[PDB]
């Protein structure tokens, strides 16, 4: 059709649907409110009931407000990602990558990875605050841990650490 | 019957008291930039960034 | 093989519509005096909710489905497909307003 | 080794023999327990040498126990019925 | 109409 | 979906061919 | 010395604390959500993910390894999943206890029908044993068949 | 190049119903038919080959630049048939290394 | 007895109106609505009290209930807690045609039924309440 | 002639260090 996705309406709708369905919440998560009378307020998730009602304790300069729990629908909550927090990718090409947040450019979040140890830019909808990686490398590659792998014609080594799409080899 | 129809209209309204609110809700419900459609790390691999157009339009060896 | 007439909501075999027409909608669709074209456009074989009515006059169900002025028989709650614009305009020429039974209009 | 034989070994006072019969000559199993929640929910990768209780979100307060496999099965069946048997390695008072 | 056709007490069960 | 048949049971579609030209071959644009 | 080495210290069990599992705890200790009734993917091995035989729940096969802990069949203890119910249901073992608690409190404002002002209630409070305490409180508040809007001064009762 | 070709996902997609040894034989035959294009098909994997004994003492960018300049020299020595590269994606691997062009 | 309850309910009505005005002004001044949430526990406790239903219907507290349920002009819906508490109170009280005529809650109920940002459970409860209120009119 | 050995105290490479067999004595 001589064009690069000239049509992007249905694609945008698919993006909206995937973004809405992919969000999952946990207790203690810092969230922000988009609509309603409580718009532009920060709070911490206290408890989760079913998948549409989330009790959130709001944070504000007034002490009497900070001791109240409010149940808020999940459709009006956006996750808050602070710089320097361990986060694990939910879904995408960089799935199961963990690291520390470096730059928060609103919708897009940049973080230094733990496995590849390089900066990766992934949308904020694909991040969950997981303080530890605990990544299992089973059912991947062609190499178990501590395998004696032939690197090339005259090079050999032993796999020291294993990753989703890379390996560490000791010659 | 007409009188109870008028009574129903009085009790429940014709909707015009909040039809404009409904129209505003439908307007805000309705809404392209490739930077927001796919990840930058996927845009870069597909050569879809602005820098790739700059490289492709500039009259110099790449 | 059975089809559900879009206008009146009755359900009859497609060959019955072709040979004898719709017994109720014949006054405005002329289905008895028409080709398979009007049978196909005004009756749909895909439907749901088979309804049998015995007494049209006193049945609240018949009033709710707007079929209390029609012949008793097989009726469908929902019919896939709508009447075309030209047939709607022809009905408006006759002074009869068409309310779709597809469920999408309410 | 039925219950009456167990009572006879109790009457003899031979605790070590009873423990060896019921563990080493039978279903001896090793599990890991969180030091906070006391549940058998630790995900241990021994060759990777990484332990983690995801619920309590801790990686350091984790112990290993030697228990019968039937005891592990009993605790898991109790957990399936929403009961929480928590195993702690210290007393409180 | 459609709203007026709601069921009453005297309608058949 | 290039075309929707009026019957509704079938529809003509635009697809990527899978042929070996003389267990299925990988999809690829038809090479004349 | 029949078990592979582990850096976790070896201790014995000194206390067993019983209790109920909270929905938050059930979701937190779970490793996968179960939502697909079909056991097998396509009747061609490799069981469906999100099903009742998900490979993250554990491995019971010689040649396969658990996808959660990475251990073999001999070492993997198994892992739990969860299943969100569309509507809450009674636990069959606690229904009489639920009934007795319902008798003990008020169905509208979640408060006990009697307060410590009654000396018998205070004596029922004093006993340390939870079973006997519940028994005494239940024996008292079962008779009381009306929430008190004011003190028998409002105790918060809805009346 | 055959041992890396047999594991490549491109080969697996090309011949889904064939085993690894068949892909090894296809890689050997392709190497006999055109060594240059077989080296080009490795993409990032051609920097891991045994090029020089002391190639590990160089920085990665230096080795990549040396390999790329060698490929540019050899490809411009050989030449690229533009119509075949437009039609056959296998032969289009040498087009980015043409003098004045790039990826 | 009943007069004291009427006076207390009228005082609650004035407090609710004052809180609604304060929250609307704060929203117009760029501040979240907090006064309604603060007043919500006392209103909930009063509404859950069954014997005060006659006094509530006498003092027409449903007008202020409608005022709280009325969306603000910025097209922002009230907090879900307020809507849930008011819907539960409406279910718990026997609202008649005369009280609806006095309060005019039917307009807001129709708005909630037609709106899409409202939760579907609240939509179904609004449909049920509208059907129950239309029931005595036709028989 | 190289032996790949696993050790507890060398945490630098998870215990894996390479030595020739001529350098070691068996216990
Ligand atoms: Zn008809
Ligand atoms: Zn724990
Ligand atoms: Zn496991
Ligand atoms: Zn009460």
Q: Where are the beta strands (DSSP E) in I29-116?
A: none
In 3-state terms, what secondary structure has residue C88? helix
- The alpha carbon of C11 and the centre of ligand 1 are apart by a number of angstroms equal to 8
Question: What are the residues whose beta carbons fall under 8 Å from the beta carbon of E7, sequence distance 6 or more?
Answer: C60
Burial of C72 per CB tally in 10 Å (0-12, 13-18, 19+): middle
Cα separation of A48 and A74, whole Å? 10
- Using the Cβ of C59 and the Cβ atoms of chain E, whether some distance falls under 8 Å is answered with yes
Q: Rounded to a whole number, what is the distance in Å from the CA of A6 to chain B's nearest CA?
A: 9
**Is residue G157 a known part of a binding site?**
yes
Q: What is the CATH number of the domain that holds C27?
A: 3.30.40.210
| CA-closest candidate to residue A58, choices A34, A37, A41 | A41
Phi, psi of G107 (to 5 degrees): -70, -10
Q: What are the chain I neighbours of E9 within 8 Å (beta carbons)?
A: 139
Chains F, H in contact: 3+ Cβ pairs under 8 A? yes
- The alpha carbon of C27 and the centre of ligand 3 are apart by a number of angstroms equal to 74
Cα separation of G52 and G35, whole Å? 8
Residue count (chain A): 171
β-bridge partners, D58: D53
Question: DSSP secondary-structure letter at J9?
Answer: S
Residue spans per domain, chain D: 1-81
Buried b (16+ CB within 10 A) or exposed e, A108-123: ebbbebbbeeeebbbb
Are the C-beta atoms of G28 and G13 separated by less than 8 Å?
A: no
Cα separation of C57 and C52, whole Å? 14
In 3-state terms, what secondary structure has residue D66? strand
- The alpha carbon of G159 and the centre of ligand 4 are apart by a number of angstroms equal to 6
**Is residue C8 a known part of a binding site?**
yes
Cα separation of H68 and H82, whole Å? 20
Cβ neighbours around D13 below 10 Å, total: 9
Phi, psi of C39 (to 5 degrees): -60, -45
Cα separation of G88 and A50, whole Å? 10
Taking ligand 4, which is a single-atom ion, which protein residues have CB atoms under 5 Å away? G 106, 108-109, 147, 157-158
DSSP string computed for chain G: --S---SSPB----EEE--BPPHHHHHHH-SSB--B--SSSSSSSSPPTTBTT-TTS---SSS---TTT---TTT------B---SS----TTTHHHHHHHHHHB-TTT--BSS-TTSHHHHHHHH---HHHHHHHHHHHHTT--S--SS-----S---
CA atoms within 13 A on the CB side of C102: 12
Cα separation of H85 and H92, whole Å? 4
Are the C-beta atoms of C58 and C81 separated by less than 8 Å?
A: no
CA atoms within 13 A on the CB side of G44: 1
Q: Which domain holds residue C91?
A: 2-103
The secondary structure element, H or E, covering residue J20 is: strand J16-20
Are the C-beta atoms of C25 and C69 separated by less than 8 Å?
A: no
Find where tokens 């039924």 sit.
I113
Name the CATH code of domain D1-81 (choices 2.40.50.140, 3.90.1150.10, 3.40.50.300, 3.90.1800.10).
3.90.1800.10
As a whole number of Å, the end-to-end CA separation of chain C is: 29
For residues I65, I70, I72, I78, the Cα torsion angle rounded to the nearest 10 degrees is 70
Q: Rounded to a whole number, what is the distance in Å from the CA of E13 to chain I's nearest CA?
A: 15
Buried b (16+ CB within 10 A) or exposed e, H10-46: ebeebeeeeeeeebbebbbebbeeeebbbbbbbeeeb
In 3-state terms, what secondary structure has residue I10? helix
Chains A, E in contact: 3+ Cβ pairs under 8 A? no
β-bridge partners, A98: A88
User: Is the Cβ pair A35, I117 closer than 8 Å?
Assistant: yes
| CA distances for A31 relative to A72, A88, G27, G99, angstroms | 11, 17, 20, 39
Structure token digits, residue A76: 């009006």
Answer positive or negative: Cα dihedral of A27, A28, A30, A33: positive
CA atoms within 13 A on the CB side of D85: 15
For residues G125, G126, G128, G132, the Cα torsion angle rounded to the nearest 10 degrees is -60
F8: left (phi over 0), alpha (psi -120 to 50) or beta: left
Q: Per the structure, how many domains does chain C have?
A: 1
Structure token digits, residue E4: 């007026």
| CA-closest candidate to residue G142, choices G102, G84, G111 | G102
Are the C-beta atoms of D70 and G75 separated by less than 8 Å?
A: no
**Is residue C42 a known part of a binding site?**
no
Structure token digits, residue A19: 């973004």
- Using the Cβ of B61 and the Cβ atoms of chain H, whether some distance falls under 8 Å is answered with yes
User: Is the Cβ pair I33, A72 closer than 8 Å?
Assistant: no
Chains G, D in contact: 3+ Cβ pairs under 8 A? yes
| CA-closest candidate to residue A109, choices A137, A132, A90, A131 | A90
DSSP string computed for chain A: --SSS---HHHHHHHHHHHHHH----TT-EEEE-SSTT-S-EEEEEEEETTTEEEEEE--S-HHHHT-EEEEEGGGEEE---TT-EEEE-SSTTTT-EEEEEEEETTEEEEEESSS-SEEEEEGGGEE--S-------S-SS--TT-EEEEETTEEEEEEEE-SS-EEEE-
- HEC secondary structure over chain F: CCCCCCCCCCCCCCCCCCCCCCCCCCCCCCCC
| CA-closest candidate to residue D40, choices D55, D22, D23, D18 | D55
Cβ neighbours around H79 below 10 Å, total: 9
- Using the Cβ of C106 and the Cβ atoms of chain E, whether some distance falls under 8 Å is answered with yes
Phi, psi of A69 (to 5 degrees): -110, 130
β-bridge partners, A113: A99
Cα separation of G46 and G80, whole Å? 19
I19: left (phi over 0), alpha (psi -120 to 50) or beta: alpha
Structure token digits, residue D6: 């167990």
Burial of C17 per CB tally in 10 Å (0-12, 13-18, 19+): buried
Phi, psi of D41 (to 5 degrees): -110, 15
Question: DSSP secondary-structure letter at H47?
Answer: G
């Amino acid at each position: 059709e001589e064009s690069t996705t000239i049509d992007l309406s249905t694609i945008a709708d698919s993006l909206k649907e995937t973004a809405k369905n992919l969000v999952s919440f946990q207790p203690g998560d810092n969230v922000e409110i988009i609509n309603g009378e409580l718009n532009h307020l920060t709070g911490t998730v206290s408890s989760v009931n079913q998948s549409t009602i989330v009790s959130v304790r709001l944070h504000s300069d007034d002490d009497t407000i900070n001791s109240e729990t409010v149940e808020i629908p999940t459709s009006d909550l956006r996750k808050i990602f602070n710089v320097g927090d361990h986060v694990r990718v939910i879904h995408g090409k960089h799935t199961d990558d963990t690291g520390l947040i470096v730059e928060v450019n609103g919708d897009k979040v940049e973080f230094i990875s733990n496995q590849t140890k390089r900066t990766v830019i992934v949308f904020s909808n694909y991040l969950i605050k997981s303080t530890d990686s605990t990544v299992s490398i089973n059912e991947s590659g062609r190499f178990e841990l501590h395998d004696l792998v032939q690197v090339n014609s005259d090079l050999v080594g032993i796999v020291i650490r294993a990753q989703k799409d890379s390996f560490d080899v000791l010659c | 019957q007409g009188e109870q129809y008028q009574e129903i209209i009085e009790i429940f309204g014709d909707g015009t008291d909040y039809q404009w609110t409904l129209d505003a809700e439908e307007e805000m419900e309705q809404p392209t930039s490739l930077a927001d459609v796919f990840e930058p790390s996927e845009l870069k691999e597909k050569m879809l960034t602005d820098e790739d157009n700059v490289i492709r339009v500039t009259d110099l060896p790449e | 093989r059975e089809r559900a007439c879009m206008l009146c909501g009755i359900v009859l075999p497609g060959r019955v519509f072709m040979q004898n027409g719709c017994p109720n909608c014949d006054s405005v669709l002329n289905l008895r005096d028409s080709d398979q074209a009007t049978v196909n456009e005004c009756t749909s074989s895909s439907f749901e909710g088979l309804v049998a009515v015995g007494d049209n006059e006193h049945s609240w169900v018949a009033k709710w489905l707007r079929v209390d002025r029609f012949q008793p028989g097989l009726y469908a709650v929902r019919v896939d497909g709508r009447l075309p614009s030209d047939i709607v305009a022809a009905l408006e020429q006759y002074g009869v307003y068409y309310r779709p039974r597809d469920g999408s209009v309410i | 080794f039925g219950e009456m034989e167990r009572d006879c070994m109790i009457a003899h006072g031979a605790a070590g023999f009873l423990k060896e019969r019921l563990m080493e000559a039978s279903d001896a199993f090793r599990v890991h327990v969180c030091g906070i929640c006391g549940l058998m929910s630790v995900i241990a990768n021994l060759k990777k040498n990484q332990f983690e209780c995801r619920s309590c979100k801790n990686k350091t307060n984790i112990y290993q126990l030697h228990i019968p496999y039937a005891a592990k099965l009993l605790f898991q069946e109790l957990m399936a019925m929403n009961i929480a048997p928590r195993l702690y390695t210290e007393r409180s008072g | 109409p459609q709203r007026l056709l709601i069921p009453t007490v005297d309608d058949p069960g | 979906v290039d075309e929707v048949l009026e019957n509704g049971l079938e529809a003509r579609l635009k697809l990527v061919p899978r042929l070996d030209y003389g267990f299925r071959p990988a999809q690829r644009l038809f090479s004349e | 010395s029949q078990f592979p080495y582990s850096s976790a210290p070896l201790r014995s069990v000194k206390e067993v604390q019983f209790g109920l599992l909270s929905p938050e705890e059930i979701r937190a200790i779970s490793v996968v959500k179960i939502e697909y009734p079909e056991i097998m993917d396509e009747s061609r091995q490799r069981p469906r993910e999100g099903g009742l035989n998900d490979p993250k729940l554990g491995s019971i096969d010689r040649n396969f390894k658990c996808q959660t802990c990475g251990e073999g069949m001999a070492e993997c203890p198994g892992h739990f999943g969860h299943m969100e119910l569309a509507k809450p249901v009674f636990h069959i073992g606690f229904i009489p206890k639920i009934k007795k608690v319902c008798e003990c409190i008020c169905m509208n404002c979640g408060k006990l029908l009697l307060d410590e002002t009654n000396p018998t209630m205070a004596q029922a409070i004093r006993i340390r044993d939870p079973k006997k305490r519940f028994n005494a409180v239940w024996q008292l508040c079962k008779t009381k068949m009306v929430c008190e809007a004011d003190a028998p001064v409002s105790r918060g009762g809805c009346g | 190049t055959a041992r890396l070709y047999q594991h490549s996902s491109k080969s697996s997609a090309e011949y889904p119903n064939r085993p690894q040894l068949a892909k090894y034989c296809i890689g050997l035959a392709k190497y006999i038919q055109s060594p240059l294009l077989e080296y080009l098909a490795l993409d990032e994997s051609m920097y891991s080959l045994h090029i020089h004994k002391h190639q590990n003492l160089l920085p990665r960018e230096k080795l990549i630049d040396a390999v790329q300049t060698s490929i540019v020299d050899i490809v411009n020595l050989v030449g690229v048939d533009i119509n075949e590269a437009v039609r056959a994606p296998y032969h289009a691997l040498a087009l980015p290394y043409v003098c004045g062009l790039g990826p | 007895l009943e007069q004291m309850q009427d006076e207390l309910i009228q005082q609650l009505k004035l407090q609710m109106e004052e809180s609604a005005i304060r929250d609307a002004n704060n929203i117009e001044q760029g501040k979240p609505a907090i006064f309604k949430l603060k007043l919500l526990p006392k209103v909930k406790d009063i509404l859950l009290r069954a014997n005060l239903a006659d006094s509530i219907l006498d003092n027409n507290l449903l007008a202020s209930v409608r005022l709280w349920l009325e969306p603000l002009p910025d097209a922002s819906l009230p907090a879900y807690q307020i809507q849930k508490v008011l819907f539960d109170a409406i279910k718990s009280l026997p609202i008649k045609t005369s009280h609806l005529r006095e309060s005019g809650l039917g307009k807001v109920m129709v708005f909630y039924q037609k709106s899409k940002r409202v939760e579907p459970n609240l939509k179904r409860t609004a449909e049920k309440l509208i059907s129950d209120w239309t029931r005595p009119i036709m028989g | 002639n190289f032996l790949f050995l696993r050790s507890r105290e060398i945490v630098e490479n998870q215990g894996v260090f390479v030595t020739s067999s001529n350098r070691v004595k068996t216990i």
